[PDB]
RNA sequence: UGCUGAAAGCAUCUAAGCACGAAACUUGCCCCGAGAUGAGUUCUCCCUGACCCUUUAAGGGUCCUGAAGGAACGUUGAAGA
RNA sequence: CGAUGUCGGCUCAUCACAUCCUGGGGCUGAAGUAGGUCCCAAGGGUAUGGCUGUUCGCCAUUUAAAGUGGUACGCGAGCUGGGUUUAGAACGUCGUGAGACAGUUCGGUCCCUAUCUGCCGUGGGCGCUGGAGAACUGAGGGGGGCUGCUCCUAGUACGAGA
RNA sequence: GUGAAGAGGGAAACAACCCAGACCGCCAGCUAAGGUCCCAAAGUCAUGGUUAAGUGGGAAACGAUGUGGGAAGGCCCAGACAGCCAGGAUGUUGGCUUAGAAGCAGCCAUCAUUUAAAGAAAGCGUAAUAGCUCACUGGUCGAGUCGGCCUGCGCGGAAGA
């Protein structure tokens, strides 16, 4: 996945979830957009 | 299980007839006969104490021949305890004999091993000595730099240096039992185990199996 | 708060049994207990369950969210029953069961043997398929996670274990 | 005990008279060589016409050492003279076609065999 | 990396809860180790006398007995400056 | 400035992690073998020579890998003394000259018996509540923790085939 | 202005910062800065909020459905938002460069019908096709909803011997 300082919304069907105090982003249809700590 | 305690007396080799010679240890594990019983009762722990051997009837002093003589038992030299792993029984007075190695395949020794005295750090820790020739100056098998400068100040502590070496209780694991011979009361082992001959030598199983 | 606002209307012969926080529910398929949470209040008025917040604690809404919904699963459990379905896509790949082991057959250099709970059972009617039946959808879930966790779907030919209609998208090989 | 700057006698006859060894390979840190093992030599001597010429780079097995070899009974074998077959270097083949001189069954392993058949004396 | 799962009727590894997960961490292996002043535990052995003084106090003194055991001395050690 | 001995080598190290190898993962323009990139991780390991005073570098041949830094660019009351940095001499250049040169070249005294802290060992005294002989539990502390190659599965999975 | 040439109390320690200028004595009291759980004198004081980060007790651009407050807006029981079933059509495959760009490589058009309504088109993939969908359209469902703005405190960014 992609750590950044940034987490941003690339794709449409990826959402923004909070997990143990970090901020991620998940897509559901391409796995590169995963990433991580902004 | 337990262990035995044993003498050690010299190492010879045995010829197997398929030309491989093994380099064996002789161990003389005498009958070493339980003389205390600890158990979690009078002690929170459970383990057994043996002897071996027997010492001079006026060698024995009154609290060791009280402590002996207490439970069945003639004075030996030295007790020793083992720690009983969890469903064992020797009743007091038993006398444990040597095939509670025939029935095993690998054993770990303990022993005292031969005293170097004190030796250098070239001996004890195998520092490397510094140049021979080539200008050096009453420095050849001196230890070098012991620390940094002044951020540090001070040698660590377990920093290697020259010390006593050897006359010191170690332990060689997993050696090769090779022959359990009860009616001479000898156990044989493959490999050299710690100390000079005539040192004792406490004799398990090996854990690390 | 619209999933708390929503009864679980619970049919033909309940036993809902509450001890202090502490619900244990019996049926014809199982019993299951659930340790609750200090923010919810359970009602048995008028014979079906309610959730309701506490007072004092914040997040009294999203608590009761969560066990208005984990006794909906518990009692549908206990009387229907879950009914979780993966299947070995691949060759060679096959899941003989015995007792309570599945025996998968993942192809590495040695076989696989799963250990099952205790409510859960494996049928399988296929070589290449698994059918677990069970009471609790979290012991159900875990066990499909841990053998599909066995070997995951490669995204080349597919092969591996597999919810049973779960999509698995196929990139080209380069 | 071949270790690096050790001069070899050549057992084979691919034209070298006197090599000399430059790394022990297998292994970080290692010291010798013994007749199981392979080195990397250069070649100092050779003969005029023969196949190999002086100041090649390639690789070696020992066949021979002072040192000798101790077999299982405790009983050594101790040549005269450090001897060694020169192999090609990615071939890992002699490139000799007879070989002088005794060699010991502890090279017996299928390359070795292939240079253990050309051998006078195992 | 997941399982169930709301807040957010869905979704979601997390908020309630649960299971995985590395030579790092704590143990398991080996050694020192109760000066661990918190100075531990167990087993055994050893001593079972008379009287004085003064501010009669965990007192001082006299005579007799020296116990287990230790130390010294000697012969010494694959123990050792 | 009533003195804090400096480059390199040797001996001995020790810590940080911004990880070279090994260990665990996500994404791949990831079929496999092999890579790339990023996250977690400091337990252990982390070449030998030629040249040069050299560190560095280039090269040769390896290795699982030949990490990056801190420690008075760690370490001269631990060793060396090649460079550099005294006095001799010479070259080129600058100067009328004495002389001068981050320009070379040859040669050229490295002192100290450890008081205190520190560390490695090793004892004496007293304490532990009558004295003594042994055997232990164990608070705690330390040591150790590296890895290649070949074979089996299997020449299967994958792949047009290699 | 203080130190130099100035002690005393505070900032853990800390000339130059804050309070205050030591003639001597006192086993007296009120105060300043700073504080009042313990070390360590004095509030585990009272009332009302915030914070979940050990913030408080080191650090920026930037990121984020963290949370508390304030003001207005878009739609909404002539039924909104999120789910769940159907539709997504014709002149018509839009006019061509192009083997097909049969709505998604490029220039022009981006207009006209059926109807509860459907863009001649927005992501992807295929020689073009196909297809999932997204706009949008009715039933169900039963009420709030989804966005910006200004603000208080938090969160990541945030690795050294």
Redesign the pocket.
């Known amino acids: ?9 690339l ?2 069907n990826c ?12 897509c ?5 957009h ?1 990433q ?3 | 299980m337990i262990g035995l305690v044993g003498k050690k007396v ?1 190492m010879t080799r045995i010829f197997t007839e398929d030309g491989v010679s093994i380099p064996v240890t002789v161990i003389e594990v005498e009958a070493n006969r339980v ?2 019983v ?1 158990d979690l009762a ?4 459970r ?1 057994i ?1 043996v002897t071996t051997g027997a010492k001079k009837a006026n060698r ?12 069945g038992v003639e004075a030996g030299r ?4 083992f ?1 009983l792993a969890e469903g064992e029984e020797f009743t007091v007075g038993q006398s444990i004999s040597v095939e509670l190695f025939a029935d095993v395949k690998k054993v ?1 020794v ?1 022993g ?7 030796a250098g ?1 070239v001996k ?8 021979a020739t ?7 098998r ?30 060689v ?1 997993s050696l090769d039992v090779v022959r359990v011979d009860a009616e001479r009361n000898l156990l044989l082992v493959k490999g050299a185990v710690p ?5 004792d030598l ?1 004799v ?1 199983p090996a ?2 199996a | ?6 009864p679980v209307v619970v049919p033909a012969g309940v036993d809902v049994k509450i001890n202090g926080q502490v619900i244990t529910i019996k049926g014809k398929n199982g019993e299951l207990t ?6 919810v209040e359970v009602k048995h008025a008028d014979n079906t369950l309610t959730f309701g917040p506490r007072d004092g604690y ?2 009294g ?10 006794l ?2 518990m009692v549908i459990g206990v009387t229907e029953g879950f009914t ?1 379905k993966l299947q070995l896509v ?3 790949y096959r899941a003989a069961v015995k007792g309570n082991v599945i025996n998968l057959s993942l ?4 076989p696989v043997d799963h250990q099952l709970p205790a409510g859960i059972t494996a049928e399988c009617p296929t070589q290449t398929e698994i059918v677990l039946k069970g009471a ?7 066990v ?3 053998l ?2 066995y070997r ?1 779907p ?4 597919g ?1 591996g274990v597999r ?1 049973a209609d779960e999509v698995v998208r196929t ?4 | 005990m071949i270790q ?2 050790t001069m070899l006698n050549v057992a084979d006859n691919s034209g070298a008279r006197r090599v000399m060894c ?9 010291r010798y060589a013994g007749v199981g093992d392979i080195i ?1 030599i ?1 070649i100092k001597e050779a003969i005029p016409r023969g196949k190999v010429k002086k100041g090649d ?1 390639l ?1 070696a097995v020992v066949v021979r050492t002072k040192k000798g070899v101790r077999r299982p009974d405790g009983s050594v074998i101790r040549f005269d003279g450090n001897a060694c077959v020169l192999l090609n ?1 990615n071939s890992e083949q002699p490139i000799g076609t007879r070989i002088f001189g005794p060699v010991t069954r502890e090279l017996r392993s299928e390359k070795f065999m292939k240079i253990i058949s050309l051998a006078p004396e195992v």
């Not at chain 2, 009078?42 to 722990?45: A, C, M, S, V």
């Not at chain 2, 004890?124 to 140049?131: E, I, K, L, S, V």
């Not at chain 2, 070098?144 to 170690?170: L, Y």
Request: with cysteine; glycine share 12%.
């Open positions: 996945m992609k750590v950044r300082a940034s987490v941003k919304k794709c449409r959402k923004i979830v909070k997990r143990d105090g970090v901020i991620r982003v998940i559901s249809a391409e796995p590169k995963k991580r700590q902004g | 010299g003389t205390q600890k009078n002690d929170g722990y383990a104490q024995v002093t009154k609290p060791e021949a009280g402590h002996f003589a207490k439970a030295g007790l020793w305890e720690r770990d303990t005292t091993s031969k005293g170097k005295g004190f750090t004890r820790w195998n520092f490397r000595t510094q140049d080539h200008g050096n100056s009453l420095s050849h001196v230890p070098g730099s012991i620390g940094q400068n002044q951020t540090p100040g001070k040698v660590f502590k377990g920093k290697k240096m020259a010390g006593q070496m050897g006359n010191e209780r170690v332990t694991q100390g000079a001959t005539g040192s406490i398990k854990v690390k | 708060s619209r999933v708390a606002k929503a659930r340790t609750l949470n200090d923010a914040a997040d809404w999203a608590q009761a969210g969560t066990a208005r919904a984990l909906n699963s979780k691949g060759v060679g192809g590495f250099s040695h609790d959808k979290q012991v159900i879930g875990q499909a996670a841990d599909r966790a995951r490669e995204p080349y030919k092969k919810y990139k080209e090989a380069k | 690096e700057q430059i790394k022990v390979l297998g292994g970080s840190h290692r990397k250069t780079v690789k270097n």
